[PDB]
């Protein structure tokens, strides 16, 4: 039970020191960094809620890290993530999770099995919230 919906999510929670290093990596590559959050971590629930506009030309990883902690405070019981956009084709290059909901209520989302004709099933993965 743990949402593995992100790079580094198979490792222990990143420390602000580690996060800053990553933030630097992105900024060094010239990537716009954004913060997002949601209570519904559905596999492929693209369009999480934006926590402020992407820190485009913010030549200071620390500045971003600030907003991160700020977000964790405003939304403790929420999933929060940093996303890096490449301003050349506009695509995501990195995405890792920071704050995760209280012991992820039930990452074993309820798997709905609608019985279709034959032995086929029409599934519906849904968070318990």
């Amino acid at each position: 039970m743990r949402i593995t919906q992100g790079t580094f999510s198979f490792l222990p929670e990143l420390t602000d020191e580690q996060i800053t290093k990553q933030l630097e990596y992105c900024l060094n590559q010239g990537w716009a960094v954004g913060l997002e959050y949601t209570d519904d971590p559905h596999p492929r629930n693209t369009y999480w809620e934006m926590f402020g506009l992407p820190m485009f030309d913010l030549r200071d990883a620390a500045g971003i890290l600030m907003e991160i902690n700020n977000a964790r405070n405003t939304f403790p019981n929420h999933y929060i993530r940093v996303t890096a956009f490449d301003s050349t084709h506009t695509v995501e290059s990195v995405v890792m999770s920071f704050i995760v909901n209280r012991p992820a209520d039930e990452p074993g989302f309820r798997l709905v099995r609608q019985e279709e004709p034959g032995r086929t099933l029409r599934y519906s993965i849904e968070s318990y919230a």
């Binding site: 743990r2 949402i3 593995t4 596999p43 990452p107 989302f109 993965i125």
Partner: peptide, 19 residues
């Protein structure tokens, strides 16, 4: 295919990512 897809789905719901 039936079983494999059942597995893939079951896996998605246990990890929270596209499988």
């Amino acid at each position: 295919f039936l079983f494999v897809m059942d597995a893939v789905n079951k896996a998605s719901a246990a990890t929270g990512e596209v499988k």
